[PDB]
Every structure is written in C-alpha cells, then in structure tokens.
Design an enzyme around this catalytic site. Structure first.
Site, PDB file in Angstrom:
ATOM      1  N   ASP A 257      -2.471   7.406  13.411  1.00  0.00           N
ATOM      2  CA  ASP A 257      -1.106   7.893  13.655  1.00  0.00           C
ATOM      3  C   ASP A 257      -0.896   8.485  15.039  1.00  0.00           C
ATOM      4  O   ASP A 257      -0.891   9.701  15.220  1.00  0.00           O
ATOM      5  CB  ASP A 257      -0.636   8.869  12.613  1.00  0.00           C
TER       6      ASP A 257
ATOM      7  N   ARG B 243      -4.065  14.123   6.634  1.00  0.00           N
ATOM      8  CA  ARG B 243      -3.263  12.949   6.293  1.00  0.00           C
ATOM      9  C   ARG B 243      -3.395  11.845   7.332  1.00  0.00           C
ATOM     10  O   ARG B 243      -3.153  10.681   7.021  1.00  0.00           O
ATOM     11  CB  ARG B 243      -1.760  13.302   6.115  1.00  0.00           C
ATOM     12  N   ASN B 244      -3.768  12.232   8.565  1.00  0.00           N
ATOM     13  CA  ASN B 244      -3.902  11.339   9.690  1.00  0.00           C
ATOM     14  C   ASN B 244      -5.354  11.050  10.084  1.00  0.00           C
ATOM     15  O   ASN B 244      -5.648  10.667  11.224  1.00  0.00           O
ATOM     16  CB  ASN B 244      -3.079  11.840  10.886  1.00  0.00           C
TER      17      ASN B 244
ATOM     18  N   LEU C 121       0.815  -1.214   0.000  1.00  0.00           N
ATOM     19  CA  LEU C 121       0.000   0.000   0.000  1.00  0.00           C
ATOM     20  C   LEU C 121       0.856   1.274   0.000  1.00  0.00           C
ATOM     21  O   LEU C 121       0.483   2.249  -0.650  1.00  0.00           O
ATOM     22  CB  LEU C 121      -0.945   0.037   1.217  1.00  0.00           C
ATOM     23  N   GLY C 122       1.982   1.284   0.727  1.00  0.00           N
ATOM     24  CA  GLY C 122       2.856   2.478   0.808  1.00  0.00           C
ATOM     25  C   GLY C 122       4.331   2.191   1.027  1.00  0.00           C
ATOM     26  O   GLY C 122       4.681   1.245   1.732  1.00  0.00           O
TER      27      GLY C 122
ATOM     28  N   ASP D  40      -0.460  15.305  16.413  1.00  0.00           N
ATOM     29  CA  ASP D  40      -0.252  15.251  14.975  1.00  0.00           C
ATOM     30  C   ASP D  40      -1.576  15.087  14.186  1.00  0.00           C
ATOM     31  O   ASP D  40      -1.634  14.349  13.199  1.00  0.00           O
ATOM     32  CB  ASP D  40       0.711  14.120  14.645  1.00  0.00           C
TER      33      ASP D  40
END
Ligand code: NA
Length: 290
Positions: free
Chosen positions: A150, A136-137, A25-26, A132
């Site tokens: 995350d 994106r998280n 996936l990444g 954070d």
C-alpha cells in the site's frame, strides 16, 4: 549540494488476455498471469474517475522498489486500469494475527518485526516515506515471509530534503508532528512502526480503542502512549516507547530496529512470555524480469 540520479525502473504493460481472474478477494481478484510463450503461470492479485492518477502514482512507486520485504509489482493493464502484483496467499497480517492468535509464538512475532524493519530500512535508503505503515498494510506470503504494501500515500524525498509537507490520513498511526503540522519523515514512519509492533504484540487489538481521532493529539501532548502488551517484557516495550518520543531524532532508526529485534529473535522466550509458545506454476519471487 547532493543532486539526483535517474530512475531507470521499467514499467511493464500487461495484455489483458494474458491473465485469468479466478476468485474475488476483497475489487481485488486472485488470478494467474501466463505471459505468452514463456511456459509459466504466476499467481497474482489483480486490483481493478480521473482521480486513475492515484493508482498510477502507486504503480510508479512500486515499480521503483525491489526488496524481499516490499511488495512486488508485475505490471499494469490499461483497459477501461488494473494493477498486477504477486499473490500473497495469507492476506494482511492484521487479519492473520487475529485469526491465528492462539497459534502464534514468539519466534514468529519477533521475526515479523525484523522483516518489516528491513523493508522500511530499504525504503529509507530509496528516500521513500511510506506514510501509511500499519499491520493492515503488511501482507503475508508465508508465515515466515512478510512484505510491506500500500504505497498510495508514499512520497519520494529529494536528496537534500528531510521532510514531506502534506496539503484523509490514519491519525492513530501517525507521529505527533504529522498530526499537528503535516510533516512526514522516515522518523515519522518509525512512530507508525511502533504502533504496528503494538498491533502484533496484542494479537491485533485496535489502538486507543474507543477514543475518537480528534482527541489523539492532545492525549499524546500530555505524554500518554499505548500500554505495555501483556506478553511484552520491558525490553520490547522500551523499543515501542522510544518509537513514540516527541523528538523525532530521538526515535530509533530502522537499521537499529533490525539489530535489536534480530538479537531478541535469537532467544525469543527471554523477550516475549506467551501461553503455549500446477507443474508450470512459478511464484513471482522466482520470475525475474530484466
Ligand atoms: Na515461554
């Protein structure tokens, strides 16, 4: 004078033979977890130096949380170390809004704001500061269901402790007190929430695009903030702006943000003005572990 209660969360140790990696996936893999003798196949993400200590800190936090808007840890595998979580098939919400920007309406946007605030309110009740929060998280299970992820910077506060004092950090999402003094609180997470909402409402633009991170604190000290997104009514922008007050106790609380966005989600076009508005497979949310 409040003391601390025991954390009786259970950390589950998985056997490598029980899971199958399917595709990268990444590195993070999409795969299936098949616990022996249970007749289930659970879609999982499998994330594969003594600083091992960070992934275990992360495992400890994820094992300690259980909420429909926070990511679900299934367990860890202690091979030469793997962290096994629920597969979130649509990936991160930042990439999701950028890629589907022409098909995203006001109901989706406002509902995501509600859900992220619910997850964050839950974390605050657990005394966890995330540190954070960003688009994106947040991960997408379905378009109608998102969860915060995350936990690698997250910290548990003591019962009588308002602040975490830190000793690399994403400057453009950080409250001003965190940039200047390394002070983190639930109210600093609220600033990051405001930035996160701004990323969603601009369909994934970069905050303070082209301004270097070292300039940010002086920009904020002078009283400047991220601009009003084109789709946002003043009602929505005022909430973002309040998240970015210098006085941290003047910022909204997550529980207030849940209320305010849930009201808006009942009349979504009043608040955002938008153009054109296998048999044995079991999702992790239906696989409950004592
Ligand atoms: Na409209």
């Amino acid at each position: 004078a409040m003391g601390e209660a025991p954390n009786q969360a259970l950390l589950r140790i998985l056997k490598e033979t029980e899971f199958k990696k399917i595709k990268v996936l990444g590195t993070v893999y999409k795969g299936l977890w098949i616990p022996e003798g249970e007749k289930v196949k659970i879609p999982v993400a499998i994330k594969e130096s003594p600083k091992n200590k960070e992934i275990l800190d992360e495992a400890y936090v994820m094992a300690s949380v259980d909420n429909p808007h926070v990511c679900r840890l299934l367990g860890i595998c202690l091979t030469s170390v793997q962290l096994i979580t629920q597969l979130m098939p649509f990936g991160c919400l930042l990439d999701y809004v950028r890629e589907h920007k022409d098909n995203i309406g006001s109901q989706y946007l406002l509902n995501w704001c509600v859900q992220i605030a619910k997850g964050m309110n839950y974390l605050e009740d657990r005394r966890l500061v995330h540190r954070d929060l960003a688009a994106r998280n947040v991960l997408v299970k379905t378009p109608q269901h998102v969860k915060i992820t995350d936990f690698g910077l997250a910290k548990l506060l003591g019962a009588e402790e308002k602040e975490y004092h830190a000793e690399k950090v994403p400057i453009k999402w950080m409250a001003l007190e965190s940039i200047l003094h390394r002070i983190y609180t639930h109210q600093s997470d609220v600033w990051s929430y405001g930035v996160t909402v701004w990323e969603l409402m601009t369909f994934g633009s970069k905050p303070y695009d082209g301004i270097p991170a070292s300039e940010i604190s002086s920009i904020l000290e002078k009283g400047e903030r991220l601009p009003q997104p084109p789709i946002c009514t003043i009602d929505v922008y005022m909430i973002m702006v309040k998240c970015w007050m210098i006085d941290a106790d003047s910022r909204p609380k997550f529980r207030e943000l849940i209320i305010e966005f849930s009201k808006m989600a009942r009349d979504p076009q009043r608040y955002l003005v938008i153009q054109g508005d296998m048999d044995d497979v079991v999702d992790a949310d239906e696989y409950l572990i004592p």
